[PDB]
Structures are given as C-alpha cells and as structure tokens.
Ligand binder design. Structure first.
Ligand SMILES: CCN(C(=O)c1ccccc1OC)c1cc2c(cc1N1CCNC[C@H]1C)n(C)c(=O)n2C
Length: 116
C-alpha cells in the first residue's frame, strides 16, 4: 500500500470509525463539545488550542485530517488541555487520564490499518 496511491474515501471511513470509538469512551460527557469560554472565562489564558470530539468530527468532515498524525495530535490535545487546566486532584483531570488510557489501543490499531 503506497502513499501517493492512497484514496481519501477509505481513509476517512477509517477515521470516522476510529473517532466514534474514541468519543464512546467519554462516558462522563466532558470532552464532546468545546469548553465554553463564556462559562470558563480564564480558559484561553491557559489553553492555546482548545479541542473536543465535536470539533474533531467537523474537522474530519471538512477534510482537515489527511494523515493519522494530525488526527492523533488533536485527540492528544483533548487530553493534554484537560490535564493542564485542571488540577490532579479533580475528577476532570482523572477523566482525561482515563480517556488517554482507553484511547491508546484504539489509536494504535487504527494507525496500523492506515499503514496497511
Ligand atoms: C463550562 C462547563 N463545564 C463545567 O464544568 C460546568 C461549569 C458550570 C456549570 C456547569 C458545568 O458543567 C456541568 C466544563 C468545564 C470544563 C470541561 C468540560 C465542561 N463541561 C462539563 C459538562 N458537560 C460539558 C462540558 C463542556 N473541560 C473538559 C475542562 O477542562 N473544563 C474546565
């Protein structure tokens, strides 16, 4: 399977499935819409690039993820943003740790498929 020959549609089908699997791990509904700046007024004082699963879905369908690195980078922002903004004694921090853990095998297996 050679990179210049790779078709977009199959790759996007793979990313759609992978994103569904990742988002399903958000059983607390913490990561599935943007952190609202109106309700968390200091959020952008700390976080340079917010990310969430709905924004990832929009990016996917707008053809913004054309390799696995860029996709995984945004999933990793969901986690890292949360670990920075929230203290390690909070439920939200631990929820990000759990999301990273559960996302791990999903992403590794998905990348292996993307590399054929
Ligand atoms: C701003 C929403 N939020 C809350 O914790 C919250 C605040 C006020 C009133 C109700 C609320 O939720 C019930 C929130 C903050 C987050 C946050 C997520 C949320 N909410 C929790 C409720 N579901 C939506 C989600 C965006 N993440 C990932 C963060 O890093 N921070 C700081």
């Amino acid at each position: 399977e050679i990179a210049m020959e790779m078709q977009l549609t199959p790759f996007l089908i793979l990313l759609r499935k992978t994103l569904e699997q990742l988002q399903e791990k958000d059983t607390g509904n913490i990561f599935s819409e943007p952190v609202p700046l109106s309700e968390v007024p200091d959020y952008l004082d700390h976080i340079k690039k917010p990310m969430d699963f709905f924004t990832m879905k929009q990016n996917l369908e707008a053809y913004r993820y054309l390799n696995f690195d860029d996709f995984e980078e945004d999933f990793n922002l969901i986690v890292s943003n949360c670990l920075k903004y929230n203290a390690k004694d909070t439920i939200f921090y631990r929820a990000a740790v759990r999301l990273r853990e559960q996302g791990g095998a999903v992403l590794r297996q998905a990348r292996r498929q993307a590399e054929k």
